């Protein structure tokens, strides 16, 4: 990554062993559950394109997702080139060349070129742009790998209401959708898919019950 | 977060892998026991609003609580805008814009804007304001997840007084996230919910009792 140093200057630092091992482990333990996307963004703070590629390449399994991810990156790279084409010409001594889509993805650029763009004034943040594409790709994978549709999330007979509600909003997170959808869906399926012992209680609470009030109300069913 | 470096100047630092794992793990192991609120506050020392959102977003389970937390944050954002509305106008070269409720929550602000507010003179501490809102939300969750009402904590016949008292103040701690009178209920219910042989001893103690003196008496 690129870090602040003790003086004001921005310098390169090797990716740390702690971060690499942490990323490999979260993938092993959580696969492509939605919470992995935030962790990736935090672990890749300040990353060069090289560092981001290392993190993705150290994943051993899930090669279908990884190959699918490569496809999404290439689609975004092509769109970059179309909206920001490279101005062709002889390069002036000491001036930077213009990054192509493939340079941002770290495939045809060197570490020194990547550092050059990121430390320019004004900075050309090839690392931050690539991370955007990777996160766009991971979002698609989490949605594909969501195992259950909310329509199939129904409260079990002995299941505590908190656990059904936990499952409900976890599925919504992978499904992502929108906030309008998340609030329309709650006003609908959460009550109908509730257990009958809880359903009677939730129905008796009346209209306008908060999520907080229903979970307190239903703490007796066990 | 924003920290002081070896020179006097305040610079941004990446959230550490150690801190992120620590927060994820304490939630997995301890859930919403009251002591998690301290831990969050310490782990979020110097945090930007982005960092606070990162910590909350990396939590995988407990999505009911997280959705409840979002409601509390949104409620707090509206009150911020109502008491500190944004003065509208063209922005002067090199001056910062005024933060809205959504900017404090890290939804509509950039990292650089967050850093700008936190390091200004005078500082606009958007990180500290957001952390307060999050803690208000977490307090409600801890209380909701309190498994027992204080009224139902009663000493077993074979339970050492120390173990009952440990359970008693833990439950009291979960209700209202401590930060209460902590005195009216104590002078009353702790004795009434004591075991029968101990209750006679506690009743016999008389007015004024230290926690220390009563536990010794019932040893």
């Amino acid at each position, epitope marked *: 990554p690129i870090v602040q140093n003790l003086q004001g200057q921005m310098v390169h630092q090797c990716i740390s062993p702690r971060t690499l091992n942490a990323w490999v482990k979260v993938v092993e333990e959580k696969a492509f559950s939605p919470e992995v996307i935030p962790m990736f963004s935090a672990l890749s703070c300040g990353a060069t394109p090289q560092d981001l590629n290392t993190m993705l390449n150290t994943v051993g399994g899930h090669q279908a997702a990884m190959q699918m991810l490569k496809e999404t990156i290439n689609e975004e790279a092509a769109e970059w080139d179309r909206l920001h084409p490279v101005h062709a010409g002889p390069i002036a001594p000491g001036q930077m060349r213009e990054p192509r889509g493939s340079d941002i993805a770290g495939t045809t650029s060197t570490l020194q070129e990547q550092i050059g763009w990121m430390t320019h004034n004004p900075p050309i943040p090839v690392g931050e742009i690539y991370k955007r594409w990777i996160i766009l790709g991971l979002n698609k994978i989490v949605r594909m790998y969501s195992p259950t549709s909310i329509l199939d999330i129904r409260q079990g007979p002995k299941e505590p209401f908190r656990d059904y509600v936990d499952r409900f909003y976890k599925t919504l997170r992978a499904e992502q959708a929108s906030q309008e959808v998340k609030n329309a869906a709650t006003e609908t399926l959460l009550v109908q898919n509730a257990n009958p*012992d*809880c359903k*009677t*209680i939730l129905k*008796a*609470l*009346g*209209p*306008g*019950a908060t999520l*907080e*009030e229903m979970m*307190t*109300a*239903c*703490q*007796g*069913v*066990g | 977060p924003i920290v002081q470096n070896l020179q006097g100047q305040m610079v941004h630092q990446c959230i550490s892998p150690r801190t992120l794992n620590a927060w994820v793990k304490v939630v997995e192991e301890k859930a919403f026991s009251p002591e998690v609120i301290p831990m969050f506050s310490a782990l979020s020392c110097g945090a930007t609003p982005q960092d606070l959102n990162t910590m909350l977003n990396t939590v995988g389970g407990h999505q009911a609580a997280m959705q409840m937390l979002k409601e509390t944050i949104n409620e707090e954002a509206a009150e911020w805008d109502r008491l500190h509305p944004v003065h509208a106008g063209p922005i002067a070269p090199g001056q910062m814009r005024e933060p809205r409720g959504s900017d404090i929550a890290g939804t509509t602000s950039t990292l650089q804007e967050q850093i700008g507010w936190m390091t200004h003179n005078p500082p606009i501490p958007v990180g500290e304001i957001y952390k307060r809102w999050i803690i208000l939300g977490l307090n409600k969750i801890v*209380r*909701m997840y309190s498994p027992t*009402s204080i*009224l139902d904590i009663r000493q077993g016949p074979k339970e050492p007084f120390r173990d009952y008292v440990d359970r008693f103040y833990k439950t009291l701690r979960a209700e209202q996230a401590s930060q209460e009178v902590k005195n009216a209920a104590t002078e009353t219910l702790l004795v009434q919910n004591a075991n029968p042989d101990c209750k006679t001893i506690l009743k016999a103690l008389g007015p004024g009792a230290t926690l220390e003196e009563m536990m010794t008496a019932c040893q």
Partner: nanobody
Framework: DVQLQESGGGLVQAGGSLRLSCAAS????????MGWWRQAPGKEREFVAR???????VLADSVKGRFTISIDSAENTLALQMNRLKPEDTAVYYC????????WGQGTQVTVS
């Protein structure tokens, strides 16, 4: 198991006040939520009041200004103080309490005019 019974209801004229009371078995602090619903002859059941543990009382909009709901743990009773009574208030009033599913009283008839 858990038994509920409303009482204190009857027929009063317009502009009067009345207090319904619902007696519960066991301790009332054990319930996680209680409230009041009503049904008038031929009309569908309408929601009147709710109190959930730890929360402020919530009242229906047609009654919000006029009714109050309270809980007395000493007498183990749930009170709905109907005040400023109107003709639309003629109905049967029910209390409910929820512990591991909900429970209803038999109702009390209230007729205003």
């Amino acid at each position: 198991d858990v038994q509920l019974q409303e009482s204190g209801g009857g027929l009063v004229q317009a502009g009067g006040s009345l207090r319904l009371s619902c007696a519960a078995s066991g301790s009332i602090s054990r319930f996680n939520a209680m409230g009041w619903w009503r049904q008038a002859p031929g009309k569908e059941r309408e929601f009147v009041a709710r109190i959930v543990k730890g929360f402020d009382p919530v009242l229906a909009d047609s009654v919000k200004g006029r009714f109050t709901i309270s809980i007395d743990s000493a007498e183990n009773t749930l009170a709905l103080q109907m005040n400023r009574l109107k003709p639309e208030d003629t109905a049967v009033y029910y209390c409910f309490a929820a512990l591991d599913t909900a429970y209803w009283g038999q109702g009390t008839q209230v007729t205003v005019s």
